[PDB]
Structures are given as structure tokens and as C-alpha cells.
Amino acid sequence: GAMGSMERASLIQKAKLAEQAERYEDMAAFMKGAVEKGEELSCEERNLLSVAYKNVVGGQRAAWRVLSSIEQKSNGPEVREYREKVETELQGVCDTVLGLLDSHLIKEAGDAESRVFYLKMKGDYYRYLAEVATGDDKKRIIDSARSAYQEAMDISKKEMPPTNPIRLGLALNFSVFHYEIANSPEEAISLAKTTFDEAMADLHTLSEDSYKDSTLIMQLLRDNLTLWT
């Protein structure tokens, strides 16, 4: 890799500079390099990894949706060609993330936090592929997403309080999977409502160092429920 000669700590440092500069492709590149050193990521480093790649693929998804909308609104080859160029790029970024997760990050040992977060991350990026997939690949991508989310859910229910932000964010994102990718509006509303209600029932488990994250996700759960009802 292009980062192989750089020290891990310099890679972390530079990802933080790139975040400050809103250079999220660079930031993602630095974090990939950090991951490839083969050591586990701390909580702060996992956030850097997550923020960088979500920013990259977020811009790609938003581009793809504009071009897809234009494509269907006109249903020459230019719109389809350009949409496939963005779609191919997006798939390449998702494959890079999923490869890092399999080659380096997802393990049987380590934190419940770390293990849930990477399985959630695997679920998300399969979901991003599922957004642009068709046919003999779509249902296979959908099942890899469901399977990764489900494992993360089992672990989180067993090992995390119901207000934990990874547990909540995972549940939010699984419910979005249900509603948008699996077309199971009932499962979506049922998971989101349970997640929110169990969070309030054990509201006392909020952590001093993450309660702002927790209460944000709880509100987003309620936003989705309002939308879906």
C-alpha cells in the first residue's frame, strides 16, 4: 500500500489533520493504512475510520441518487454511462471497506463494543451495495447485510446496555435496512419502537462520556417512526 512506509502514529495523526481539513478521501486513506499495520483500533480510531469512509461513500450515494433520478425521469447513453461510472466507484469503496473488515478488523476476540461496531459496519456497507444492486447479486447482498446486522444484534443484546450508542446506532441502521432494503415496514417499525422503548425503560444506563450520542440516536429512532406512521 501507499501508506506502508508511514508509521502508524503518523497515519493516525494525519487522519485527524485530514478530518480537520475536510479531506475525507485522504482521511480514509490514512485510516486504511493504519488498519493495515495489523493492530486493533481504539474507540477514537474506530470513529476516525467510520467518519472518513461514511463521508466518502455518502457523497457517492448522494451523487448516484441524483443520476438515478435523472435516468429514470428520462425513461442517448450518457446518463446511464455516467451513473454506472459513479456506481462502479461506489462499489469499489464498499469493497475496500468490507475487505478491511474481513482481512483485519472482524475477530472473535476483543471488546463487545469493537465486535458489534465492525459487524454493524459490515452490515452498512453491504446495505450500500444493496442500494445499487440488481438481480443475481441483489438478494445475495441483502442476506450478507441481514446476517451481519443480526450477529451484531445478538451480541449487543447480550453484552451492552440498551442505551449504548453502538447498540442504538446498530438498531437504527438495521431498522433502516428493514424498511428500505428488505421492504419489511412492520419489522422496521417493530425494531425501532422496541429499541426506543427499551432505551427509555433503562434510561439510567446512559454513560457520562456518550449520552449525547445515545440521546441523538433515540431521537432519530422517533423521527423514523413518525415518518413510517
Binding site: 470513529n47 467510520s50 467518519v51 461514511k54 463521508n55 452498512d124 446506532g169 437504527l172 441502521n173 431498522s175 433502516v176 424498511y179 428500505e180 450520542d213 441523538l216 440516536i217 432519530l220 423521527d223 423514523n224 415518518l227 413510517w228
Partner: peptide, 10 residues
């Protein structure tokens, strides 16, 4: 509005 997923924080 579409469904909202986990945002980026810090």
C-alpha cells in the same frame, strides 16, 4: 425525506 441512519459525530 427518506429514512435516517446513523450520522457522523465528532
Amino acid at each position: 425525506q427518506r429514512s435516517t441512519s446513523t450520522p457522523n459525530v465528532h
